[PDB]
Amino acid sequence: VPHKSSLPEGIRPGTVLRIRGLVPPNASRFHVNLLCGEEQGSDAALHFNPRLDTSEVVFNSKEQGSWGREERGPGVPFQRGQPFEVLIIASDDGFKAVVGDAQYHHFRHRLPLARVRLVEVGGDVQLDSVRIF
Amino acid sequence: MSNVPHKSSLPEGIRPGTVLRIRGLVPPNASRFHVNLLCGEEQGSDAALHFNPRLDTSEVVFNSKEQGSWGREERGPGVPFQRGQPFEVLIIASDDGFKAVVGDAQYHHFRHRLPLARVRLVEVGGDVQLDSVRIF
């Protein structure tokens, strides 16, 4: 079952999302989604998708039911059997993804930051905590 | 010789979305310590933010300094620092001010008095053992 953090006021430049958890021993992939509503199939301002089985981290957006063009970060800073800490930092121009205290990828906004209403974490991850500062 | 404040430069300044992470330890007999967001490298430069945990009065004072004059102090609730204990502080810049997070809890919101665009260095001084300043 996915974890959901409701943000009915939305988020602004200066919003910090900290996601901690464990990648379990046989994990295929997991995701952190910044969604614009609570309906299934809602728009995704950010889809952050570490894929352990393919050794890729995919970034994408979803807009009226259709996915955009994927972006990929450099390699995969996640491992089966290892805990992680991800920061997703909203600024005026995009999201900064920090993994293991290292700046990892910058994802330019494709949807207005103001439309975000929900953070959802799902897939093969054993969640420690999601915090929004 | 000891107690020289630690400085970290901000070569391109800071913006909404800048995250300052300050990790340290409060010495067993600390009086007070501070984190300053300063607008220049000279003594007496303006402080966009002065974050001043005071253990001997059990309070946390927030303020700004402009033209060598301190502004109106604000205080957070109580004091989430303890002598002899490690701490982690987040200072997060937004459009409307700085959010101070202490011990993983939102602690105070200090609305901007000086422009974020003028902040050019982080200074940590007082009775504190500084482990790391990281800028995200």
Residue numbers in the entry:
A (entry chain A): 4 to 136
B (entry chain B): 1 to 136
Cite, word for word, the article reporting this structure.
The two refined structures, structure 1 (homodimeric Gal-7 binds two glycerol molecules) and structure 2 (homodimeric Gal-7 binds three glycerol molecules), were crystallized using two different conditions, one at a relatively low concentration of PEG3350 (12%) and the other at a higher concentration (20%). Homodimeric Gal-7 binds three glycerol molecules at its two carbohydrate recognition binding sites (GOL A and GOL B) and the new binding pocket formed by its N-terminal and loop connecting strands S2 and F1 (GOL C), respectively. Monomer A of structure 2 can bind two glycerols. Its N-terminal (Asn 3-Val 4) and loop connecting strands S2 and F1(Val 124-Leu 130) form a GOL C-binding pocket. GOL C can form hydrogen bonds with Val 4 and Gly 126, respectively. In addition, GOL C interacts indirectly with Val 128 and Leu 130 through a water molecule in the new ligand binding pocket of Gal-7. This means that the N-terminal of Gal-7 interacts with loop connecting strands S2 and F1 via a hydrogen bond bridge formed between GOL C and a molecule of water. Discrepancies between structure 1 and structure 2 in monomer A are due to the absence or presence of GOL C. B-factors of structure 1 suggests that the N-terminal regions are very flexible, while the N-terminal region of structure 2 is relatively stable due to the binding of GOL C. Glycerol binds the pocket near the N-terminus of Gal-7, which can greatly reduce the flexibility and improve the stability of this region. It is noted that glycerol binds to GOL C sites of monomer A but not monomer B in structure 2. In addition, we found the GOL C pocket, which binds glycerol in structure 2 of Gal-7, is deep and negatively charged with surrounding amino acids.
Galectins (Gals) are a family of animal lectins that bind β-galactose-containing glycoconjugates, and their carbohydrate recognition domain (CRD) has a conservative amino acid sequence. To date, 16 mammalian galectins have been discovered, and galectin-7 (Gal-7; also termed p53-induced gene 1 product), belonging to prototype galectins, is a multifunctional effector by productive pairing with distinct glycoconjugates and protein counter-receptors in the cytoplasm and nucleus, as well as on the cell surface. Gal-7 participates in diverse processes, such as controlling apoptosis, cell migration and cell adhesion. Gal-7 was crystallized in complex with glycerol under two different conditions.
